[PDB]
Amino acid sequence: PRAELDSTVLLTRSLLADTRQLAAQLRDKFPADGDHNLDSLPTLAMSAGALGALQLPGVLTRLRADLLSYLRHVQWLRRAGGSSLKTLEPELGTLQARLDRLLRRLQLLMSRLALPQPPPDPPAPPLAPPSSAWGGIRAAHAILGGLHLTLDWAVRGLLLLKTRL
Amino acid sequence: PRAELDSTVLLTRSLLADTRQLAAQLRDKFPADGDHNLDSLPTLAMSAGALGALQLPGVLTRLRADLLSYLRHVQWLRRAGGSSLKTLEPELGTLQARLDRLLRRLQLLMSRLALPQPPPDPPAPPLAPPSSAWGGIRAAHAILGGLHLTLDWAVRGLLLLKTRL
Amino acid sequence: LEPCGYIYPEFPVVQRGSNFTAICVLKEACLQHYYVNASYIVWKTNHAAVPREQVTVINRTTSSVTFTDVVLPSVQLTCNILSFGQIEQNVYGVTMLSGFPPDKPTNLTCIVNEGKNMLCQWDPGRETYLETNYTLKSEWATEKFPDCQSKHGTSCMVSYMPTYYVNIEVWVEAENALGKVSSESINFDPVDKVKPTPPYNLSVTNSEELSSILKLSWVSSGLGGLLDLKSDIQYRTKDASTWIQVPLEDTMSPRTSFTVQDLKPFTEYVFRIRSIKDSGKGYWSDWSEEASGTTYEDRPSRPPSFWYKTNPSHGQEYRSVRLIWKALPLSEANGKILDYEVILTQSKSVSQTYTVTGTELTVNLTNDRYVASLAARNKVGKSAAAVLTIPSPHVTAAYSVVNLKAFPKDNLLWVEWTPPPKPVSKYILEWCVLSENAPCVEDWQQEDATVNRTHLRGRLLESKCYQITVTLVFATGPGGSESLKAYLKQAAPARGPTVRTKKVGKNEAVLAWDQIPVDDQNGFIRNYSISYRTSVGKEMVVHVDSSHTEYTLSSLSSDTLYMVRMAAYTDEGGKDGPEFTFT
Amino acid sequence: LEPCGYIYPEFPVVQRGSNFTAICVLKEACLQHYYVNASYIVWKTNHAAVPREQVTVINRTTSSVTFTDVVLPSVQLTCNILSFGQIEQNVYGVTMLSGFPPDKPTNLTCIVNEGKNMLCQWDPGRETYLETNYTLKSEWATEKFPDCQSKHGTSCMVSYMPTYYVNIEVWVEAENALGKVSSESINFDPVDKVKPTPPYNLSVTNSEELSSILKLSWVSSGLGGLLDLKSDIQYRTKDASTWIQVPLEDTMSPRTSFTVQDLKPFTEYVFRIRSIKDSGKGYWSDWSEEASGTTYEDRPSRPPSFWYKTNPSHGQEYRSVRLIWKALPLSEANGKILDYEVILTQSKSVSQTYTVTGTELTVNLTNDRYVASLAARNKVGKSAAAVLTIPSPHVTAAYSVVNLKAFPKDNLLWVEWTPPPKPVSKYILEWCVLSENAPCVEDWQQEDATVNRTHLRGRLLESKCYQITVTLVFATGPGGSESLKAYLKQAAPARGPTVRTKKVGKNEAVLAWDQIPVDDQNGFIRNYSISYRTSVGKEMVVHVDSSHTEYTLSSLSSDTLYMVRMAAYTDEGGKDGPEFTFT
Amino acid sequence: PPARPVVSCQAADYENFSCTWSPSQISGLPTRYLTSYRKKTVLSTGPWPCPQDPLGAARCVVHGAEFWSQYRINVTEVNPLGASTRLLDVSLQSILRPDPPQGLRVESVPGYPRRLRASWTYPASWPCQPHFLLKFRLQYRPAQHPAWSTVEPAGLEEVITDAVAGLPHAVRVSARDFLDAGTWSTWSPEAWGTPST
Amino acid sequence: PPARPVVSCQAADYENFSCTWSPSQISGLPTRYLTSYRKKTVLSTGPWPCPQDPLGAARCVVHGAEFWSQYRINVTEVNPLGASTRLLDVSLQSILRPDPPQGLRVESVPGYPRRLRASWTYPASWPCQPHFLLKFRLQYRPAQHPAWSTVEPAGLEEVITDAVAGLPHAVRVSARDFLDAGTWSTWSPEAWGTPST
Ligand SMILES: *[C@@H]1O[C@H](CO)[C@@H](O[C@@H]2O[C@H](CO)[C@@H](O)[C@H](O)[C@H]2NC(C)=O)[C@H](O)[C@H]1NC(C)=O
Ligand SMILES: *[C@@H]1O[C@H](CO)[C@@H](O[C@@H]2O[C@H](CO)[C@@H](O)[C@H](O)[C@H]2NC(C)=O)[C@H](O)[C@H]1NC(C)=O
Ligand SMILES: *[C@@H]1O[C@H](CO)[C@@H](O[C@@H]2O[C@H](CO)[C@@H](O)[C@H](O)[C@H]2NC(C)=O)[C@H](O)[C@H]1NC(C)=O
Ligand SMILES: *[C@@H]1O[C@H](CO)[C@@H](O[C@@H]2O[C@H](CO)[C@@H](O)[C@H](O)[C@H]2NC(C)=O)[C@H](O)[C@H]1NC(C)=O
Ligand SMILES: *[C@@H]1O[C@H](CO)[C@@H](O)[C@H](O)[C@H]1NC(C)=O
Ligand SMILES: *[C@@H]1O[C@H](CO)[C@@H](O)[C@H](O)[C@H]1NC(C)=O
Ligand SMILES: *[C@@H]1O[C@H](CO)[C@@H](O)[C@H](O)[C@H]1NC(C)=O
C-alpha cells in the first residue's frame, strides 16, 4: 500500500498548503483577534511523543473522525455563513471537495490495509446556524485553524506509519 | 382607434411575410406534394364580395377564433411534432410569440372599439399528438398554409374596416 | 457564553462626509468572565486602531466611537477588548459602508441594431461608490417584458425580441442601500429607432454609350424590405480625398440604383453609401464599403502636338522627314490610345496613309510641298486631325518672331515674343542643352496661336545652358526660327578661367585667357576680376567686363616676379582660376 | 382516413455503398378512395423522381424501390401516388441516412494546462458522415466523473478540477446509429501530464566584479511550488540568431537563478527559459519572453593604435607634433572609453601629462628626443600604454623597408614588404589619394611587428590613385619611409589624351601630348594607340608605350590634310581623345 | 381512346377565373367536352357544371370563385372511343395575374432637368377596391441604354430623380396584388418622356 | 506598583519551550517572580507551576509541551507594592525556530570545475525523528560578490551546478520544519570552498 500512503501524504500536503493560504487570506481581509473556538470541533490533545507511539487503527480512526466532522462544519459554513464567505470562493468549495476526495482516499487505504472498517457512526445533529455573519467569520477562523492543525497531525502521523510499513 | 388599426395592419403584414418565408423554407427542405389538411383547422368559405359586406363584430370574432385556434395548433406542433421542427427554429417560436402579440393587440382593439368583448369560449379538447414525425411535417404544411390564408383575409378585412372608420 | 456583545447599528450605511456613531455593548457575563469593563474596549478600523476618538462615559458596559468625515467606502470596524488588560479579544465587527444615493439617470436613449435586441443606455451620474442594480424596466399596455439588468450600469441589452409597431414604455430604476430612484419613462415605438445595417454587394457599372455616367447598384437588407430605406450617396475622384455628396433630395425615396452624371470622361471614382428609414426617423447606418469604377473611355478631345524635322539632304530628290508627336495626356486621350494614323497628302496626288504605334515616323518625302495629317485613334474613334504643311525645301521663311525674350521666373524658364502681323496658326518651340562634349539633343513643345508667352514644359536642369528656338508655323508652313540662350538657374562656375600671358614688357604685361567651357560655366559670366601681386607687394584687383578676352596690366615693376590670379563671376558668385606667374 | 400508407423501414440507416430496399404499402381504403393501385406510386428522392428503378410486382397494394450504391448521406425519400392518375398525392416520407460506423479513436492523449481542466484529444478516424456523440468517459476506483462531451469530436475539456495524485481511468466512447465503439482506456496520474506555464518576471543582473558573468533570475509558478520544476535555458549574443543552450544537466534541479559564464566582456545577450517537472514527466512549458542584459565593461585589452605627425618647422626651437590615435573597437574598448591619457617624457626630465577626449593632440615639442605614451582609460582603468619614441628632427632614419609591393586582391588593396634585418617594434602605414586639385589627405593604420603583409583598412575608392607610404617604427623611432602608387580598382580613363603637333615636315609630323591628369586617369596607363587618316585614305593605327610622351609620324603624304586621333588605355580599356588635324 | 386534354386556367381579377382547353391530339370524331368543377375540403361543395361560353368556345368562366379556396377542374372529352378526363387544381390566390397598368404617361418636371414624372392608372379589369389594391413595379432606362433601373413606387405616381438630362427614357410598369398574391403582370408597353430643359 | 514584566518564549525543539523574563523597570525592592502556565480550551488543564531553573535564573522550561495546543503563560512579580501580571499566549508550532545546521562543508567536485558539493548535519538539538524532519535552505555566492544565490536543497547534500570556476564561494544554510511550522533558523556561519581545477 506504499503507493497509497505516499499518494495520501502528497494529497494531504496539498490540502494543508491550500488551507494555510485560505486562512492567511481570511486573517488579512477579516482581521479577528484572539481565540475563536467552537466547542463542537474535535480537540487534539496528544504529545509529540504520543503520536510516535500510536498504532494504525487509532491513528486512522481519529483522522477520519476529525476530517469528517470538519467536512460537516465546512459545509455548514458555506451554506449558512451567508454573504461574507463568497469572498473566499471558489477556494472554500475547492477545500471541501479535496477534503471529501481525501476522506475517500483514506477509506480506500483502510480497505487496502484490511483493517476493521470504521463504524457507521450515526450523523451528528445539525449544527445550529451561526448567530450572524460575524459569528460566521468567527466560525471560519476556528474551523480553518483546527483543520490546519488536524492536517499537520495527519501528515506527520501518516509519515510515521510509513516508516512502520 | 386609427393608430390601433394601422399598427395592427402592419403587425399582421410582418406576420404574413414571416409565415410565407417559413412556409417556403419548409416546402423546400421537406417537399410534400398535394393536399395536407387538418379537419380541425378553421375553414375560410366566403367570397371576395362577401368580405366587403361584413361588419366589425363578425370580422373580429372570426379573426380572433381563427388566429387563436392556429396558436393552439402551432404550440401543439412545437411540443409534439418532435425532432424535425427544430430545423425551423427559432422561426416557429418567433411566429407563435408574434401571433400571441397580435391576438393581444386585437383584444385591445376590440376594447377600444367598445364592442361586446368576445365570449369566454371553453378550451378546445387537447389535440391528439401526431401519429409520427411525417404526420408532424404534414401538420406543419397544413397549419402554415391555413395561417397564411387566414392572415391574408385578416389584412384585407382590416383594411376594409379602416375605410369604414 | 454567547457573543460578548453586539455593535449598534450592525450595517451602517453612512452618507459620505457625514458623521457616524457606533456603540459596542458588552454583556455583563463577558465582563465578569474577563474581569474588564468597557474602558478596555479597543476600536480598530481594519488593522488601524482608532486613536481614542471613542468615548466610554456612556456606562460601565458601553463604549462609543465617533467618526468625522467618514471617507473610506468600506471599513471593517471591529470592537475588541483587552482581556485582563493584556490579550485583545475580538467582540464584534461591522462593515461600515459609505457612499451616495444614485443620481437619477438622464439621457435614456435606446437603439435597435438591425437583427439584434434593443440596446438602451443612460448617464449613470456621479460615482456612488456602492453597487447599484440599475434595472431597465420595460412594459406595454398588456404585459411587462423581462427586466434587463446592466452588468456595468451604463447599458443593458434586453433579451426579448424588439417589439416593433408597439409603443413600449421603458425606464431605468437605480437602486442602492442609500436610496432608489427611477428615470423618466420614455414612450417610443422601437421601429423608429432601428439602425439599418450598411448596404452590401455595392457594385458599379459604366455606360459604353455614356462615358460621363456610372450606374451604382446595391443590395439593402431592409429587414426583408420591411423598412423603406432612403440612402445618402457620396463619391470622389480616386485621388481626391474630399467626398462629394450626391444631392440628398435625389435619394429621398427607396431605390437600389442611382445614375451619377457629369463624371470625367475617363477617370476612376470611389463610391460609398449609407441608408436610413425613408421617414428619416432613427439613425443613419454606417457607411458601406468603398466601391470603384472607371468611366468608359471617350473620343480624344484634342489632336496631339504635331511637328516635323528634316535632316539636311541637299542633292537628293528625296528628303528623310522625321515626323514626331507627343502622346495625348489622359485628360485628352480620354482612353487607351491604340494607334496614331498619319496621312500624307502630296498636294493633289493620292494621299498616303500610315498607321504608327510609336511617337515618330520617318518618311522619305520628295522635295515637293506636302501636307501632313495626324489623328489619334482610341477604342471609340479618331481624334480631330492635326495638320502640318511641310514646305518644299526651297521655300524661304518670310516671317520670324521679333523681340524674343526668355527669363527664369518661379523656378521656370519662361519665353515671350511678339506675334507677327500675319495670323499664326500655331507656335512650335524647341530647345537643347548647349554643350561642347555632347550634341544638341532637341526637345520641343506646341503652343496655340493665341499664346504669346509660355514656360518650357520639360525637365530643365539648373546650371545648364539651354539654347532656345522659336519657330512660327503658318498655313504655308514654318516661319523663320529665332534663337537665343538662357539658363533656368545659375551657379558659380565649376572652374575659374585659365590665365596666360600674351606679352610681357619692362612695366606691362598683356594677359590672355580662354573663355570657360560652356559645360563649366554654370551661368551668365558677367565680369572677371584679375588679382595680381608680387612676393611682397599688396595684391591689386582689376575688374574686367566678361566681353573682354585680354587685359594689359600696367605700371608693373621691372625685373619683378608677379603672381596673377583670375576669377570669373556669375549672378551667383564666381570661381577662382589657377594661379599664374610671370616675370 | 388514416395516412394512406407507411414506408418500411421508417428510419433506414444504410451502410454507405451498400444496397437498400424500401417498400411503400397503401391501405385498401386509400386505393378505393383515390381509385388507384400501387402501380401509380411515384418515388422521389427529395425533388428528384426515381427513374423507375422501383418494381411493383409485389402485389396490388405494394411498391418497392431498390437503390444501388446509395451515396447521398441524407435523402428525403417520399412515396407519392398519382391520384386518379393525375394529381400526385404524398403518402409518406423517410429520411434515408447513410454513413459509416465510427472508427475506434486512437492516440487518446490528455494534457493539463496549469490552472485549467484536463484536456484530452483523439484521432476521430475516417469521416462518418453521421453525428457521433464522442463521450470522454472518466472514473477512478470510487467514483465516475461527469461525462465530458466534445462539441467537434476531437477534444473535450472536462468540467471537474484535475484530480491530481489519483490514477484516473479515461476512455472515449464514440456512438452513432450504425454502431458504438470505445477507445482503449488510458490509466494515468494527471499530475504527470501537467504543462507548466512559462517562467515570468525573467530578469538579468551583471557582476561589476565579473564582466564575464550574468546572473539570470526568474519566478516560477510551480503551482505554489507544488511541482519541483527543472528548466532549460538558452541564450545568444543579441546579433546571433543561433540560440546557445546551457548544458541541460546543469539545470536538472529546482532553481530560480543560474550564473552564465564565459560571456564576452562587454556584449549584449538575450536569454529565454522554459520549465518542466523535475522528473521530466509531462511536457516542457512554452518559452518565456526574451530577457536581455549587458556584461559589465572591462579594462581595455589592447592599447590604441598610436602615431605622430610633424609639420616641418625648420628654424624653430619648438615643433608642433600632432599626436593621433584611433579609438579602440568595442572588442578592445570592452567598455565606455571615457578619456585618453597622453604622457610625454623628455628623456630624463619630468614627464608631462595630458588628458584628451579627442583622438588627436597637438603639442609644441622642442627639438629634443621625446618618448610619447598613450593609454586608454575606461570606467575600470587604463589600458596598457602605447609607447612611441619621437626622434629628434636631426636623427636620420637608418633603415627602410625593401621590396615593397602593393596589389589589389579580393577587392582589397594589399601591401607587402620584407622586414628589415633589425627587430621592428611595429609598422605604420599611411596613404592618401593622389590628386592635382586637392591635397594629400593622409590616412593611416598600425601593424604589429610580426605582420609583413596587410590590407589597407579604409574606405578606399575605385578608380582613384592612392599614394601608399610605409614607415618602420623602431625603439629608436621611425625608420625610412618607402612609398609607391597603386589602385584598388581601375577603369577606362575619364578623358582621352590631347594631341598637339610639335613639328611638321614634308613627309613627317612630330606629335606631342600631355599626360592625362591623375584626377582623370582611372587606372595605370599601359599604352596609347595613335590613329591618323587623310580625308580619303585608310586609317592607320600605331601603338605607343605609355612611358613615351611624343611620337613622330613617318611616311606621310606631302601637301595632305591629316586627321589624328589618340586614345589612352588602362587594364580596363581606354578612352578616345579629341580629334586633331594638321596639314 | 382520346388522350388527356390539355387544360389551363387564368384569373384576370380577384373574383372570376377562366379555363381553356384543347386536345392533345384530335380524335378525328365528333367529340363533346364535359366540364365541371368542385370545391375541395377535408375528406354546397358538389360538382357544378361550369358555364361554357354560349359561343360554343372551349372556355368556362367560374363566376364568383372562392378566393382563399382550392377548386378541382374536371374536363372530360367524351366520344365513341370512351371518356378521357383532365383534372386540374386551381386557386385564384396563386393563378391570379393582373392585367398591365393602362395609360402610362411620362412628363418633364419643370425646373428639375434631372427628374421625370411617371403616372398611370389601375387596369380597368381590376376594380381596385381598397382591400384589393395593387402594388406596381416600374422600370426606366435611356432610349438606347438597355439596362433597366428598377423601382417599386407607392401609388400611381413616381418621380424619377436620376433621369439623364435630355435623354429620352422609356418607362414600363407591372402590377401585383399588394399582398404579393399571384404573380406580376406582364410589363406595360414602353412610354417615352424627355426631361425638362 | 511594579510595571508589567517583559516575557518572551522560544522553542529550540518540537517538545520543549523555554520562557525568560525581566522587569520593565527595577522596583528597587526584594521582588519574587511567581510563574505559571495553563492549557487553553473552550470556555488535566489547570495551572501548573513551571519549573524554574534551580540556579535561580529568570527562566522556566516547559518540558513535554503539547505541540498543537495553545498555552497561556502567567508571570507575576509579587512584592510589597502589589502583584503585576504578564499574560502571554504561546504555541510551539508558531514560536518554534530550529537551531542553525551544524558542520557545513563545501568540497570541490572532481572533474566538474563548475560544481561544488555542500553537505551539513541536522542540529544536535533536533533529534530528527522521521515525522519531524527539517527542510533546509542554502545560499551561495562568490567571496567578494555579495548577491546570494538561493536554493532549497532536499536532504543534507546539494551540488551547486553553477559555481564560478576557481572563485571561492561562501555557503550558508538555514533550517525549518518540513511542514513550514515555526520560522527559518538563523543562517549558519559561512563556509569556504573552491571549485576543482
Ligand atoms: C369527371 O367528370 C366525368 C364526367 O364529366 C365523370 O365521369 C362520370 O362519372 C360518373 C360517376 O362515377 C359515372 O356515372 C359516369 O358514367 C361517368 N361519365 C363518363 C363519361 O365517364 C368523372 O367521374 C369525374 N371525375 C371526378 C374526379 O370528378
Ligand atoms: C366577374 O363576374 C361577375 C359575374 O358575372 C361580373 O359581374 C357582372 O359584370 C357585368 C359586366 O360588367 C355587369 O354588367 C353586371 O352587372 C355584373 N354583375 C352581375 C350580377 O352580372 C363581373 O363584372 C366579372 N368581373 C369582375 C372583375 O368582377
Ligand atoms: C496569575 O498568577 C497569579 C499568581 O501567580 C494569580 O494571582 C492570584 O490569584 C488568586 C486567584 O484569583 C488569588 O487568590 C491570589 O491572591 C492572587 N495572587 C496574587 C499575588 O495576586 C493570578 O490570578 C493569575 N492569573 C491568571 C489569569 O491565571
Ligand atoms: C526536552 O525535555 C526533556 C525532558 O527533560 C528532555 O529529555 C531528557 O533529556 C536529557 C538530556 O539529554 C536525558 O538525559 C534524559 O534521559 C531525557 N529524558 C528524561 C525523561 O529526562 C529532552 O532532552 C529535552 N530536549 C529535547 C530536544 O527533547
Ligand atoms: C448603557 O448605555 C446604552 C446606550 O445608551 C444603553 O443601551 C444601555 O442600556 C445602558 N446600560 C445601562 C446598564 O445603563
Ligand atoms: C474600569 O476599571 C478600571 C480599573 O479597574 C477603573 O479605573 C475604571 O474606573 C473602570 N471604569 C468604569 C467605567 O467602571
Ligand atoms: C393497376 O391499374 C391499371 C389500370 O387500371 C392496370 O392496368 C394494372 O394492371 C393495375 N395493376 C395492378 C397491380 O393491379
Numbering used by the authors:
A (entry chain D), B (entry chain A): 35 to 199
C (entry chain C), D (entry chain F): 25 to 607
E (entry chain B), F (entry chain E): 112 to 154, 164 to 317
Relevant lines from the article:
The signalling receptor gp130 represents a paradigm for differential signal activation and functional diversity. It is required for interleukin (IL)−6, IL-11, IL-27, oncostatin-M (OSM), leukaemia inhibitory factor (LIF), ciliary neurotrophic factor (CNF), cardiotrophin-1 (CT-1), and cardiotrophin-like cytokine factor-1 (CLCF1) signalling. For IL-6 and IL-11 cytokines, gp130 signals by homodimerization of its intracellular domains. Similar to IL-6, IL-11 coordinates gp130 homodimers by forming a hexameric signalling complex comprised of two molecules each of gp130, IL-11 and co-receptor, IL-11Rα.
Complexes comprised two copies of the human IL-11 cytokine variant (IL-11 fused to domains D2 and D3 of IL-11Rα) and two copies of murine gp130P496L mutant (D1-D6), in agreement with a human IL-11 complex which came into press after submission of our manuscript. The final map was refined to a reported resolution of 3.1 Å using the gold standard FSC 0.143 cut-off; with local resolution ranging from 2.6 Å to 5.4 Å. IL-11 is a helical cytokine that coordinates a hexameric assembly with two copies of IL-11, IL-11Rα and gp130 through interactions at three principal binding sites. Site 1 of IL-11 is formed by the hinge between domains D2 and D3 of IL-11Rα. A comparison with the crystal structure of apo IL-11 shows that these residues undergo a conformational change upon complex formation. We observe that for the IL-11 complex, the sidechain of IL-11:R135 at Site 2a inserts into a hydrophobic groove created by a hinge between domains D2 and D3 of gp130 (V190, W164, F169, Y184, I192, murine numbering). Here, IL-11Rα:R235 forms a salt bridge with gp130:E273. In the IL-11 complex, the Site 3a is comprised of a series of electrostatic interactions (gp130:K68-IL-11:D67, gp130:H71-IL-11:D62) and pi stacking between IL-11:W168 and gp130:Y116.
